[PDB]
């Protein structure tokens, strides 16, 4: 597998990259908050009647 | 032992749950490394003058 | 013998996903990205700064002027890699 | 809070669960400039107060670190802290003064 696209930064000592433009990215995060509430009656799962 | 096996088998669904819970371990550990480390999806090199 | 001891009985080390070498990878591209990019990089395209520049920017985030930064600079180099040289003698003097 | 400049959050039920839809700020489209530490003016050392020094190939200006708006270099928008021989890199401009123009006239 590959880890990703190959990248290289044009580094020097005296350059920079500025932004000229902006994306306003809207993301989603899903996040588990509860679960299901279970409640068990021990001696009618073991016994029954 | 095949005679263990069939009396293995009675006790119902006991291997189903510890192999299911051992491969949710299992492939959680890959996720936590994936979260860890595979943050960024270019990857990046130096120059060649360091 | 220990490892055969469990693989007889059932029990199997399952090799992980991502090898050392791909991991060291990305470490490697974390560290590149951090150092010609700054934080640039997680956050966005990666723009080229110059590492000086990096840290007067850095030396903004505390609270310290950027003058601080570039009138030390040889300095704060020599601290800098000092304290590298440090870290790996630590890390390698220290069992624990 | 998501991949990028976090600006705002908003919150959206789900069954056993919470949704977030992060808005961030990414930049893009980025330009090349060549930058220096310092603007050497006088003898004495010019410092951004809040931007970064580029240059466009002929002329030199101050700008905001995360969005290209140029601007002159003035005495307004930089800051001296002492001579030009300690700076690594610091190059030869001139810093405008506001006050100029105003007792010239
Ligand atoms: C800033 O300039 C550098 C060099 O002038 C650009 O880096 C080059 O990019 C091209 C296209 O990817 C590569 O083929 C070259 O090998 C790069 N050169 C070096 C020295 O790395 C860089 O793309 C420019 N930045 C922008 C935003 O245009
Ligand atoms: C910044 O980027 C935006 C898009 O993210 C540009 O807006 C586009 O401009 C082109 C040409 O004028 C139009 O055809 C598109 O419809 C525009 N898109 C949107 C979403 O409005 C904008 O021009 C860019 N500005 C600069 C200075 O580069
Ligand atoms: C760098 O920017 C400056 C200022 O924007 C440019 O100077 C102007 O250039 C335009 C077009 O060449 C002229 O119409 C103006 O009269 C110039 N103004 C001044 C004060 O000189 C300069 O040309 C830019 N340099 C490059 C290489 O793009
Ligand atoms: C920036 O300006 C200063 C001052 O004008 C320059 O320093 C002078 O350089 C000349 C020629 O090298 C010397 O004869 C003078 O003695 C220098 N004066 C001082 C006070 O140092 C400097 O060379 C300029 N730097 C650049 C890169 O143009
Ligand atoms: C500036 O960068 C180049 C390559 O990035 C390097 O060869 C040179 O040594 C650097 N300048 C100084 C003064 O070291």
Not at chain 1, 26 to 42: F, N, Q
Not at chain 2, 5 to 31: H, M, P, W
Not at chain 3, 25 to 51: D, E, N, R, V
Request: hydrophobic letters at 35%.
């Amino acid at each position: 597998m590959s880890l990703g696209a190959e990248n290289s930064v044009a580094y020097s000592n005296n350059s920079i990259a500025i932004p000229t433009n902006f994306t306003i990215s809207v993301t989603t995060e899903i996040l588990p908050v509860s679960m299901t509430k279970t409640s068990v009656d021990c001696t009618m799962y073991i016994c029954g009647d | 032992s095949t005679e263990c096996s069939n009396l293995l088998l009675q006790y119902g669904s006991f291997c189903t749950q510890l192999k299911r819970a051992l491969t949710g371990i299992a492939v959680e550990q890959d996720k936590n490394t994936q979260e860890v480390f595979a943050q960024v999806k270019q990857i990046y090199k130096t120059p060649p003058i360091k | 013998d220990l490892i055969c001891a469990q693989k007889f009985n059932g029990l199997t080390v399952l090799p992980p996903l991502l090898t050392d070498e791909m991991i060291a990878q990305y470490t490697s591209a974390l560290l590149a990205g951090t150092i010609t990019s700054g934080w640039t990089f997680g956050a966005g395209p990666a723009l080229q700064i110059p590492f000086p520049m990096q840290m007067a920017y850095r030396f903004n985030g505390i609270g310290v002027t950027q003058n601080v930064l570039y009138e030390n600079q040889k300095l704060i180099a020599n601290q800098f890699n000092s304290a590298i040289g440090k870290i790996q003698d630590s890390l390698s003097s220290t069992p624990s | 809070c998501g991949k990028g400049y976090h600006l705002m959050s908003f919150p959206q039920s789900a069954p056993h669960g919470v949704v977030f839809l992060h808005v961030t700020y990414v930049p893009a489209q980025e330009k090349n400039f060549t930058t220096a530490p310092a603007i050497c003016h006088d003898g004495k050392a010019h410092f951004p107060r809040e931007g970064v020094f580029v240059s466009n190939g002929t002329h030199w200006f101050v700008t905001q670190r995360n969005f290209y708006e140029p601007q002159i270099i003035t005495t307004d928008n930089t800051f001296v802290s002492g001579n030009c021989d300690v700076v690594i890199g610091i190059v030869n401009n001139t810093v405008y003064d506001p006050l100029q123009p105003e007792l010239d006239s």
